[PDB]
Amino acid sequence: YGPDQRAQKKGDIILGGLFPIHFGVAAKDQDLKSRPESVECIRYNFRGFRWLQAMIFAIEEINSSPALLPNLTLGYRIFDTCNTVSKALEATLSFVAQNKHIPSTIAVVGATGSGVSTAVANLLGLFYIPQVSYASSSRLLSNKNQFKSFLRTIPNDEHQATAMADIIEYFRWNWVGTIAADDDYGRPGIEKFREEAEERDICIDFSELISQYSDEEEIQHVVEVIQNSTAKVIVVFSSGPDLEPLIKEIVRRNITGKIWLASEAWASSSLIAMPQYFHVVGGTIGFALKAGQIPGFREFLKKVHPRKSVHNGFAKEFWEETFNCHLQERPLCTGDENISSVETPYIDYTHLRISYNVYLAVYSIAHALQDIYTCLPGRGLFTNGSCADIKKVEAWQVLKHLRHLNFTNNMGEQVTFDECGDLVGNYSIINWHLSPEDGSIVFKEVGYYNVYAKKGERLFINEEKILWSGFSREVPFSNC
Amino acid sequence: YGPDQRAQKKGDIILGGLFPIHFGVAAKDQDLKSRPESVECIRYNFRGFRWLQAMIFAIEEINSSPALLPNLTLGYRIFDTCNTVSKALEATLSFVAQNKHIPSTIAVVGATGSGVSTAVANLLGLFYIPQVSYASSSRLLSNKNQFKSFLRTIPNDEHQATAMADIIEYFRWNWVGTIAADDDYGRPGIEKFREEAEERDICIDFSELISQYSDEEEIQHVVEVIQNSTAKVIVVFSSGPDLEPLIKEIVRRNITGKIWLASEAWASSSLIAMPQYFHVVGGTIGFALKAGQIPGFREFLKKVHPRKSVHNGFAKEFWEETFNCHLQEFRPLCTGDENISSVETPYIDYTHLRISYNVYLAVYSIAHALQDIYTCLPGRGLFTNGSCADIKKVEAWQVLKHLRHLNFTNNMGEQVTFDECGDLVGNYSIINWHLSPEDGSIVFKEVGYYNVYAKKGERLFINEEKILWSGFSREVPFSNCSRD
């Protein structure tokens, strides 16, 4: 066994999952005067519970389609990582139990953070179990001499760093500053951006590192390095949880007049995009991925219930955190409430971008299994052209099949992995505005970034649709 | 349970160990046409076997000392990592199996590389098992949020970057290039060196990354970048295995006239300090640690035997590699009475003990924490109500708690305490690569030191009269972009 709070189903082939239902763990000092106890998690993530339902919906769709895997069923075992390495390792130790009563896991759909993904892959690669991530994008995971069984449905960050350099060069600036998160996602990206910007003759004034668990003194020190600079453009490679304290402190001091360039990790985060921070973070220009279509998904999301869903263990806490009640086994829950009456990121969305990667990964695994199913003798990828046995399939055979995958998605495009298990994708450039009728922060698309074009003709920006600092139509000046 | 070859002993308390007996694993691409099998390690490491013997010597010395933990016995289980993450992870999975019929491990002497140490600590901190490292010096391991039970007996790498910047400023240079290894040891150190340099008005021309498994194209690109530059001083944060291919490629192209600044990982490596490379890597200036004295270490080293060291399983391959003979269960059969003094190998070819002393101190730290556990009185304990831990039923977190509060004197009269981050502070020694007039090998000569207990600006001391700038020159080179 492992963590108690989980969602699982019984089937012929079992799949794993790792989602961040909580934002982090609680800060409790340990003087180790008595026996240590397991740490708890603090903040609920309504957007992270929408990604799990995508995998569940995809599996349930596969089980009902006779063309994909007839006479077979799929199960799952999905755990919560709370965006922490230790909890992810504790969950993973149960995935590889029998390989060293416990069903064997064929594949695991990866985690979000790059630091968590490296730790999980270091353990999964021992037994050659494939792992498909949907959000990890650090160039360090492309090394096949260390990460043997890692795959992606999301591109890495070198293109995005080059795009930031191109954007800066397009608007004729040469005096900028940089801020990055102290993890495996922030440092490589900001290093690549620095390498790109030095070639184009752009001067960088300062460079600082931030973290979610930073104390008061270093946050104060970082704040009064921005205040002592004539640079208006600041480039940030971080996530919302790692950036929240700095934004709070800057708002507390009422620092205005800067231009923020946001990476896709926090270019759409609900933690930073809040109406009371708009006079500091308004006018941000950021990146977003390309959205896809999953018909029938919203109907599947809208039917969740703490009592009807017996296979999902996270439904009770979802209900409690939604309606602010307590389930009888703070008011009591009648169980007859309506989800639509509460505005939360669960069904308050405009596009499916990360949640379209989970669906795509699940179909990747399904199509690899289908190819295993229909191997005619003498046409296999194994020794002497022999084929695998679908009744006794193994994880390494699934890995060979995913290494050689080439299938079509529901939108008519082709999906296939390159030599490093990576992909290629278009980028979308958005701008932060203010809703006149409601006051919420609205993302407006103002261009894109082609990746299949020649090196120099990749960026398109329509400046006529950009508001600078949220109110002005004039391009600012940053030159020293 | 675990790997096959190991060194093992029985006792009341079990310790763990991880040493790189091999330099690396074999580079065979794996096709999935058949079931994957275990990979094999290729190159033997005679220096890593000397570190393994220090732990055994310390344990045996403790077991015979009535003044330290009497009426108790210590055991061990030592594995080989081949400086690869997967092997160390298998060993660690062996270590924690019943900590969740197997004796429990209460402490582990950590790994050598920073990536391996990080991967081991990620899993060891789950069960609150203390881990004392002797060679990992990355600054990313000082984060107590992620690494909860990590200790080390070697200082981190901040002062080395500061000292390199100080040296460059002292010799009046403003045009350098940087090369680093693509791991957790090279990147943070080289980043720290860049910041200190810019604050000191030093311009950097190029920056490159290298690895042990780089292909021809990357090495050729790095070589092309180096020789299309007018910078003479090159700063390298790497180790010998990660630097060897680039050095070989540079040597075969006959590239001379460069000044190398070496970190402690490769400033004394036998893979780089070869007489055949002297016309390229001669005159290097590097850093070394302070040395200690172990009164009877060499006598213990000299008595190894493949038929008498029952508890040691690496002695057989050590003998076969040393004497180039094949032991009967075409290489000649080993006679069994062959002296180890005839063969010149780094096993007993040393001048100072620096990392072996670190292993020694790592073992005595745990011994003294256990002695503190044993010799306490009620009402004065470190626990909730002053209660003392039971020595018979001791647990790992109690040992970690006493390690966090350790304070004891070593055999050299100094004090050993761990700070809030589990770190030590130490001096540095600055050395220079010469050519031996008699033997013809490379001789490391001390020409200065770095003091960490002084104030900023008065930490570096250099004696310029003892420096040979390329093994033969006596004048400081010129490394400015443009003339004054």
Ligand SMILES: *[C@@H]1O[C@H](CO)[C@@H](O[C@@H]2O[C@H](CO)[C@@H](O)[C@H](O)[C@H]2NC(C)=O)[C@H](O)[C@H]1NC(C)=O
């Ligand atoms: C700020 O610096 C940029 C970059 O040097 C300037 O952009 C240049 O503008 C001139 C026309 O005024 C062009 O001929 C150059 O080709 C531009 N540079 C580039 C991108 O190559 C910008 O004008 C400067 N602004 C001020 C007024 O200081």
Ligand SMILES: *[C@@H]1O[C@H](CO)[C@@H](O[C@@H]2O[C@H](CO)[C@@H](O)[C@H](O)[C@H]2NC(C)=O)[C@H](O)[C@H]1NC(C)=O
């Ligand atoms: C190489 O450049 C350095 C840096 O500009 C020069 O060092 C400076 O020399 C002047 C002249 O004596 C001093 O006033 C400065 O204090 C020096 N700076 C530092 C940081 O030491 C150096 O002289 C140049 N070397 C040559 C041969 O031209």
Ligand SMILES: *[C@@H]1O[C@H](CO)[C@@H](O[C@@H]2O[C@H](CO)[C@@H](O)[C@H](O)[C@H]2NC(C)=O)[C@H](O)[C@H]1NC(C)=O
């Ligand atoms: C680090 O090195 C410095 C300098 O070599 C040591 O300081 C010296 O200590 C001796 C012994 O007391 C004194 O006689 C010298 O006068 C000191 N030198 C200076 C410049 O003050 C220091 O003790 C060393 N640190 C350790 C921990 O050994």
Ligand SMILES: N[C@@H](Cc1c[nH]c2ccccc12)C(=O)O
């Ligand atoms: N790729 C990011 C994770 C991420 C991508 N998009 C996100 C959106 C929300 C939260 C996290 C993410 C990382 O490496 O850490």
Ligand SMILES: N[C@@H](Cc1c[nH]c2ccccc12)C(=O)O
């Ligand atoms: N300090 C190095 C390890 C190391 C020190 N001395 C060495 C000698 C040989 C090999 C490795 C080392 C690291 O952080 O990784």
Ligand SMILES: *[C@@H]1O[C@H](CO)[C@@H](O)[C@H](O)[C@H]1NC(C)=O
């Ligand atoms: C994938 O399949 C398509 C359609 O059969 C084919 O044109 C293409 O060459 C295949 N391979 C790749 C790498 O796209």
Ligand SMILES: *[C@@H]1O[C@H](CO)[C@@H](O)[C@H](O)[C@H]1NC(C)=O
């Ligand atoms: C990316 O955008 C360009 C814009 O012209 C388009 O031509 C191309 O088809 C897009 N590619 C994908 C994969 O969406």
Ligand SMILES: *[C@@H]1O[C@H](CO)[C@@H](O)[C@H](O)[C@H]1NC(C)=O
């Ligand atoms: C350790 O003990 C010595 C005396 O035995 C004392 O001088 C020293 O200050 C102690 N260490 C610390 C960190 O207080």
Ligand SMILES: [Ca+2]
């Ligand atoms: Ca089916």
Ligand SMILES: [Ca+2]
């Ligand atoms: Ca004793």
